[PDB]
Amino acid sequence: AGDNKGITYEELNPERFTLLEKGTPTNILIDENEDQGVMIAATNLSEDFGRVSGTNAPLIFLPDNERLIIVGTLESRYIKELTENRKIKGDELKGKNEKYLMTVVDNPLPGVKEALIIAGSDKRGAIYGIYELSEQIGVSPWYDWADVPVKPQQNLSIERGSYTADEPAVTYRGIFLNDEAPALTSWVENTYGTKYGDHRFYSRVFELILRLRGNFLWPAMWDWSFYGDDPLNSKTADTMGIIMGTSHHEPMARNHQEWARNRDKYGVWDYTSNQEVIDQFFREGIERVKDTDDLITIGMRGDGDTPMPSDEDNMRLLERIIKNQREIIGDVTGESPEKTPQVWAIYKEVQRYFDLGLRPPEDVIILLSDDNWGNVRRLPTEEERDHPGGWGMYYHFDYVGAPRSSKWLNISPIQNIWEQMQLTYDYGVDELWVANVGDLKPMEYPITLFLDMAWDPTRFNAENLLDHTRSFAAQQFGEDQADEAARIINLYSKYNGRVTPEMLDRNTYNLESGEWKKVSDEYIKLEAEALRQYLTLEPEQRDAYKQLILYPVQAMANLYEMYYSQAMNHKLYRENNPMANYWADRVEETFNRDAELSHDYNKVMANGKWDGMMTQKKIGYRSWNDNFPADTLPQIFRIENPEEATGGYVFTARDGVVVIEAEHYFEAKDAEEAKWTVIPYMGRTLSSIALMPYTKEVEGASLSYRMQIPDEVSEVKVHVVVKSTLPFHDPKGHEYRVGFEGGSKEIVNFNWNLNEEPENIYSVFYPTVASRVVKKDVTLDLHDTDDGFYTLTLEPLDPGIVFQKIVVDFGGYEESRLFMEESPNKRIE
Amino acid sequence: AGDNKGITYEELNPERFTLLEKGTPTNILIDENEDQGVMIAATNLSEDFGRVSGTNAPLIFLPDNERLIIVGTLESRYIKELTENRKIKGDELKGKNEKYLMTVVDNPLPGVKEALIIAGSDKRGAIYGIYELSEQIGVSPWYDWADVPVKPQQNLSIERGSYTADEPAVTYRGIFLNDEAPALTSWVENTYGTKYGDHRFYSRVFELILRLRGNFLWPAMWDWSFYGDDPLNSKTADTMGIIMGTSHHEPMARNHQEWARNRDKYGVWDYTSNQEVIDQFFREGIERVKDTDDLITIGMRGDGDTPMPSDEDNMRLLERIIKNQREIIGDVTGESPEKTPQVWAIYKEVQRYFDLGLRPPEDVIILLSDDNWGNVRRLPTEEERDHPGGWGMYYHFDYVGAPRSSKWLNISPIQNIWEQMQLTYDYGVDELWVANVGDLKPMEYPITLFLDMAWDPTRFNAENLLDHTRSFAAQQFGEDQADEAARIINLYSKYNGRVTPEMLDRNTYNLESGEWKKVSDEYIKLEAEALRQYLTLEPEQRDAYKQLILYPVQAMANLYEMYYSQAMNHKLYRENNPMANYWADRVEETFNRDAELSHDYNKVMANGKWDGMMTQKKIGYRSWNDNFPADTLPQIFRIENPEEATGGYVFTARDGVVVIEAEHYFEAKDAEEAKWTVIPYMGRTLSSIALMPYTKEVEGASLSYRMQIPDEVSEVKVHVVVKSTLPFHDPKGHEYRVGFEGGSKEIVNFNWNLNEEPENIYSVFYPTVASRVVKKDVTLDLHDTDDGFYTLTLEPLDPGIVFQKIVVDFGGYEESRLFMEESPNKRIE
Ligand SMILES: O[C@@H]1[C@@H](O)[C@H](O[C@@H]2CO[C@@H](O[C@@H]3CO[C@@H](O[C@@H]4CO[C@@H](O[C@@H]5CO[C@@H](O)[C@H](O)[C@H]5O)[C@H](O)[C@H]4O)[C@H](O)[C@H]3O)[C@H](O)[C@H]2O)OC[C@H]1O
Ligand SMILES: O[C@@H]1[C@@H](O)[C@H](O[C@@H]2CO[C@@H](O[C@@H]3CO[C@@H](O[C@@H]4CO[C@@H](O[C@@H]5CO[C@@H](O)[C@H](O)[C@H]5O)[C@H](O)[C@H]4O)[C@H](O)[C@H]3O)[C@H](O)[C@H]2O)OC[C@H]1O
Ligand SMILES: [Ca+2]
Ligand SMILES: [Ca+2]
Ligand SMILES: [Ca+2]
Ligand SMILES: [Ca+2]
Ligand SMILES: [Ca+2]
Ligand SMILES: [Ca+2]
Ligand SMILES: [Cl-]
Ligand SMILES: [Cl-]
Ligand SMILES: [Cl-]
Ligand SMILES: [Cl-]
Ligand SMILES: [Cl-]
Ligand SMILES: [Cl-]
Ligand SMILES: [Cl-]
Ligand SMILES: [Cl-]
Ligand SMILES: [Cl-]
Ligand SMILES: [Cl-]
Ligand SMILES: [Cl-]
Ligand SMILES: [Cl-]
Ligand SMILES: [Cl-]
Ligand SMILES: [Cl-]
Ligand SMILES: [Cl-]
Ligand SMILES: [Cl-]
Ligand SMILES: [Cl-]
Ligand SMILES: [Cl-]
Ligand SMILES: [Cl-]
Ligand SMILES: [Cl-]
Ligand SMILES: [Cl-]
Ligand SMILES: [Cl-]
Ligand SMILES: [Cl-]
Ligand SMILES: [Cl-]
Ligand SMILES: [Cl-]
Ligand SMILES: [Cl-]
């Protein structure tokens, strides 16, 4: 159900029209001389009933059956017979652009008791109506290009009534295959054996664009020539009903490589110098595509993506170029020039030629363009909205250039596409919308949004935008999966809008403020939610879910954690803290995970159907272009010999406290026989530390913490957190001596009251014990010093004390389960 | 490989002993009059070769085969023949406790060219050696009780040499089934049809304890009587080689329920009052277990978990009770009393009886006990370490009582078990170690650690502790999975140590400081890492992974997010912010997910093998006990009519700034025709807001933000972040007027310089555009006010400005990608 939702049911009903009964499809009646592109779509619908039911819908040319699905254009014999007998409201289609009419009617023809009619105003309107039914029975436009499975059915009925999508609001609506190496090129080679895009590949692109209800394509042009590499390319597009175009610097239906490949035979591409050969270039161009409905790019820039002393009389060079471009069209097409659709794209030295009134002939479409990052540059004023030929918009989902290429994943928030396209429509630009899609994949969702907006931008607003995302998800994964799948698509798109993967690195986010950890943790949360959903899917759904959701999310969550880890590696390495080695390991592991994930996408997902599609490098950019060998491991640093890199931590106060994890001492003096032993992971946070073993005297032992406090401070509250050890050796309890060396020192008895005596047993004892820790505080007078450095000192007086955390409190203390983030520190010897 | 690692290979070798060749196991030779418990283990080993190879190892009674695995005790005929011919070092086993000897020997007996010998010093030492081989060939002790699959093999050889575990350091090592309703009781009923634990159930518990190398059990005693409910219970334990005991208040081999069930027939349980019937109770107790090696609890507390005016002569009551308890043992056992192992547990009014020297007879074991939360209360002094009978330790992994029961999941950090048990051993307590395991599951890992420490505590230290976890993981999931599986077990155990699930709620963690978000996000990260690992497992491994890792992690990560969400719900509801409704929904969803997860564990995992094991309630505690109906939805609050709950936000400064998300205005005046429209999710953070549509004049419109600043502030820097809209309508750019109403106001032109002119194109233009936002700052003079409240005002002057975020900066501003955490605020009308 693309256009009309909730009219096809999975049970039959007397007051509904049966499309499929106990496995057998209803036959499709078609005029055998129907437009060949419409027959192709009808054949695809016949096979779509095959995908649903197990048997193809018989495609017939005579009303043999008592009930029928009758398809065709207004001019085909059966539709023509229906409008003439007023069985169908033909007035609602005659003259209309790309419109279908879908309605059940009783006794359409003699011998037919009841039929579903799909009548198109023209070729494409018939195709669209057919594919509307295709969706109704459960074949997503993405059934091939993103492996979206078809729910098998045994019976289908459709509600009566008259159904339409009306006419599209934008005349030309399509995509540009661009930035296509190495991905799309690798995939076309692996799949078709061709170092070019041939008509097998392009017809497969055409069916998609048509199922999506678009009509337009700029073919790939980096190393290919859509018109020259295969003579069926133009012929197939013309038959199937795609309008072909060329990009802004490819005038006159010549693909750029047709000139490049023969720079030796051809001249220089300077109109005044090389006029003769270039005019011949242009002519055979229009010669090749006359009798098709292709858009003719007119004008002239440079060759490559460069422009072309100028100013007054240079503007008159362009004027001239358009003039004789049009007589060339006239001499070839036979008709006059305004009978051939033409488009003049504007860029650099043209917005400037705009003001003195450089406009093309009235009939020509003026193709505006975005900034390569989704923001429109110029729009028509109220005065020039008049323009008869109308206006286009070229929009980027993918871009190679400044400030850095973006070639890997979708980077376009849903809100950003809509917010800028709604503006585009509201200012009158509605003749051509074409979006740069990179390799097509993985832009599946923005493409669907882009084209659905081009059909009817009026049905989108800020409140209902994500309703579109939810509908898309329900189509791909089913009603039960839809809310959560759309939620993920929206979120990962938004995260990707924050910074492109190619421009993400260790310095993107703020590390001290905790921002890096937030966005890294939060993307992994999204990955966890996508993993949970993935386990609930039916097997036949996993490949589509991975292509539309799981791989983008996993690959980005992994990329984020990699750079976050690099940022932590450098911080700890600067600080001389051997924990740097852990984060170095994480960088390595996440870097390799990135290759694991793309290897899966290419080689394992869908049995390697998409091998090549996910081979763009992404890690190792140094300039704007991806001209470096391959994904490169971000630089990491390691502390040699990390076991003898202990002690010597000195802290600096921040935000009212000095919070210290107990193992980050400045020095530790061992006892007689018993030695300071750190216990990894023990406690609520970093680790614990204790003299071992517990059978030895602790006499003389001490831990020492070096810290800097602002001179304005006169007394402090010292919190020491230890493990909730009980008084096992001696009922009077465990004591330790805390104090600033050079100043006053109190002793703490932290478990004298942890027992089963009535006043303690439930008031203190069981509560503290079930928490596993005890926290004591002394209040200590801070003496004077000239450098501001102090040495806090912890001296145990009984065995088995497990020190865990210290916080000196001079204002900024916050009650909390983990006893606050550790204060800044670094290491010395 | 439990005891000896890296001696069994998957290929054969001339200098190794073949255990399995091309599918055929080597035969096991056993004396047919061998101890019946040893034969049982040998039969289990025969079937373990079946689990590995597909065919069971033939178990034979004569040396028919040229090569053999020869098992038995020192007294069985074949082992006896080997030690006498000095083929085996019998001196290394005679007298030793529970020791095996495993060694290849050539020509052991005539007609046998080569055999692997497994000789035990006694019954249990033989069993242990057999199960050592069981592990060598790949059968985990957890192959049944946690579904750990057996890697199929076609050939196995074992290295030559002499192999042993020596003797255990703790004489009795076992578990207490306790807190066993509703889980273990439900599972036993579902599995065996019995509202009691019968000998089918207990033998299955025995095989586990033996494969784990323990020898001790306190059976379940809440509603069952191990000795009374089934006469094969004692007989099976005696045959298989388990030492049975009873808990601290179950004297004389009587299970508590044997008294409870007949409170009517029996008397009151007051020794002085009801002496006659209680002595008869005690007697038939010892009568029932004489001729077995069971531990006899002596002493007397109350019935229930309560004690029993006292002081001087009351201590003489206990003295007397022990005295005649021992003559009862003497009159029944025939021998004297010190020939029967006895244990006196100490609790409440006994540590006090301790000081005046209340000690039992010298031969009796004194069973100390922890605090029910893993911390030891008393340990022997150097003077009383002398005690001939020795000392025990009762340790909790599970507990019903103060301050709140803990009955759902493992809560014991690995470090905490070790740190307190290493102390226990070092102080001389090495006769009995028994751990309260709840329902056994899901304590699989702490049980293995506990018992492995009881075998040889000397091999554990702070540095190598987690080596044990890694070895355990490699056994359950394979070398390739081990590091990451152990990492997860360690972490989730640590997190659970921070607070028990039953005591977790909205107020556990600090929300303002971001601590709640940290621990919630971090547990979900652990879940994501466990999910990733789960997808790499072979199918046959998934059930074990879910039981030992995935379900604890998912269930806790979900529980944490639930309470975190509740905490957010209440904060936003207090603040009158309709976002509260989102968090209410999350509480509901996570609450139901908790039931999804346990439904899976019970009913779907392993085809419902474990149905009942995971039915403990956990959500809805109000006191210490789980006496409430069922898991209950934590209380949430919702803002009625949340669409008309906009505007009226007023902010309070914190930490040097006022950070405002653009949609949290105090008031918004609409324009003529164009209306303030908020665009969900748009931008880097909360959302965007803009006058729509863009075709209307914006004259007069404004947003207003109300905020409180400390009176000490005289001027501010105001940062406004908008979308990077370009100057599409008018090349001079977009302008807006920012200022404090009642004070000065500057205007900002944020895109006058976003174009392709040479000085802008790569310096500013492409960088800002690819970032999707622009940030401008004015510096504004702050005027005087008496309440400290100000009204910042944003007035657009051109169409299409997308406001996203504001931060007024008076010191605390931090450069960051998201422009800082939003400042505190609330809502009014
Ligand atoms: O950082 C700042 C820089 O941004 C600034 O650098 C400018 C960036 O913008 C660049 O213009 C882009 C150049 O690249 C064009 O794409 C072409 C398309 O043709 C491709 O050729 C094919 C490649 O694949 C092969 O296999 C095949 O054989 C080829 O036919 C070519 O690879 C691409 O580069 C873009 O469309 C332009 O937008 C500009 O050149 C830079 O100068 O400098 C300042 C610095 O501060
Ligand atoms: O919050 C503070 C409180 O902590 C304090 O409350 C005390 C908590 O400690 C309690 O002692 C525990 C009581 O419960 C015992 O377990 C029994 C075992 O027997 C069970 O009976 C079976 C239940 O299942 C049935 O199906 C079966 O038929 C029964 O046989 C019974 O359910 C359990 O309760 C524990 O072992 C004790 O440790 C103490 O009673 C409380 O007073 O009060 C102060 C407050 O501030
Ligand atoms: Ca790409
Ligand atoms: Ca029009
Ligand atoms: Ca790679
Ligand atoms: Ca339990
Ligand atoms: Ca001993
Ligand atoms: Ca439940
Ligand atoms: Cl087809
Ligand atoms: Cl419509
Ligand atoms: Cl070719
Ligand atoms: Cl034509
Ligand atoms: Cl034409
Ligand atoms: Cl709108
Ligand atoms: Cl809605
Ligand atoms: Cl952004
Ligand atoms: Cl900070
Ligand atoms: Cl670590
Ligand atoms: Cl040291
Ligand atoms: Cl004190
Ligand atoms: Cl002391
Ligand atoms: Cl068995
Ligand atoms: Cl050992
Ligand atoms: Cl019974
Ligand atoms: Cl015996
Ligand atoms: Cl005996
Ligand atoms: Cl030790
Ligand atoms: Cl190690
Ligand atoms: Cl804790
Ligand atoms: Cl804070
Ligand atoms: Cl939300
Ligand atoms: Cl409003
Ligand atoms: Cl300016
Ligand atoms: Cl203006």
Residue numbers in the entry:
A (entry chain A), B (entry chain A): -1 to 306, 318 to 838
Task: Please share excerpts from the published article on this structure.
The xylan-specific α-glucuronidases from glycoside hydrolase family 115 (GH115) specifically catalyse the removal of α-d-glucuronic acid (GlcA) or methylated GlcA (MeGlcA). In this study, we report crystal structures of a bacterial GH115 ortholog (wtsAgu115A) identified in a metagenome from an anaerobic digester fed with wastewater treatment sludge. Furthermore, wtsAgu115A eluted from a gel-filtration column at a volume consistent with a dimer in solution, which suggests that wtsAgu115A is a dimer in its active form similar to other GH115 xylan-specific α-glucuronidases.
